[PDB]
Structures are given as structure tokens and as C-alpha cells.
């Protein structure tokens, strides 16, 4: 099928920045990111469409996270700023052969851990 490989995860501090990227072996119309916190359901984060490039975000990350995609490279990037400790989760990248991202997509990633430490 289509395989998704994630990159960039790790440790960040509250108020910090972090760039996740995801490389797909193939091109789908919808690329994006979900995340799963310990003891919580997997939730949608962001997604972007092939043509036109239209980005849409979950209510809880709008204004802090952005998403982009390189259609030639088949990559999708989640840029995180204003990170909060509750942003700590496993971040999965996802691809979907649909006009809008589904919660049961065609393709999933291995998920990369993102941990937002607090200060003091």
C-alpha cells in the first residue's frame, strides 16, 4: 500500500516549537496528523488537501499549529508553536484517499512521541 514514515519528534518545553514531518511512499488527496494521549482516544490534529491546498485544524490546536505539504515529495509537515504540557502525545501522520480527512483513514504511521515538559 502506501507507507508513512514520521520524523522530528522528541522533547520540548512549554512555549517552545517543534517540527514534525511525514514522508509517504505515494500520493493521496488528504495528508495530515492525529495524536493520542495516554489514556485517551486518538484525536484529529490537522490536515491539508492536494488541490487546492486547504489546511484545517482541530479547535484545540488552531492558532498554534500549522500544516503544509510538498506534493512533489509526498511529505506533510506539522509545525508546532506555543506548545503546552497537554500537547504531550504520540503524533501519528495519516493519509486518506478522501476529499476530507476521515477518523478511519486508509494509511497510518508508526507515531512519534512528543513530550512537552514544564518549567520550574
Amino acid at each position: 500500500e502506501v507507507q508513512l514514515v514520521e520524523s522530528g519528534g522528541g522533547l520540548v518545553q512549554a512555549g517552545g516549537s517543534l517540527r514534525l514531518s511525514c514522508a509517504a511512499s505515494g500520493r493521496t488527496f488528504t495528508m495530515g496528523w492525529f495524536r493520542q494521549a495516554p489514556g485517551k482516544e486518538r484525536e484529529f490534529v490537522a490536515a491539508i488537501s492536494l488541490s487546492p491546498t486547504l489546511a484545517y485544524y482541530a479547535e484545540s490546536v488552531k492558532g498554534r499549529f500549522t500544516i503544509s505539504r510538498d506534493n512533489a515529495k509526498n511529505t506533510v509537515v506539522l509545525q508546532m508553536n506555543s506548545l503546552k504540557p497537554e500537547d504531550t502525545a504520540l503524533y501519528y501522520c495519516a493519509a486518506d484517499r478522501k476529499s476530507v480527512m476521515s477518523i478511519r483513514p486508509d494509511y497510518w504511521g508508526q507515531g512519534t512521541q512528543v513530550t512537552v515538559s514544564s518549567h520550574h
Binding site: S49, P52, Y56, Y57, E59, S60, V100, M101
Partner: peptide
């Protein structure tokens, strides 16, 4: 609004639905 994504979606992505 998509409740399952909890997200606002441009309606352009649904004209062809």
C-alpha cells in the same frame, strides 16, 4: 463543522460529494 474531527472544513472539499 466536523464533530468527529472537531474541526472547521472548507465546503469546497465537499462540492464533489
Amino acid at each position: 463543522f466536523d464533530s468527529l474531527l472537531h474541526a472547521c472544513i472548507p465546503c469546497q472539499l465537499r462540492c464533489s460529494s
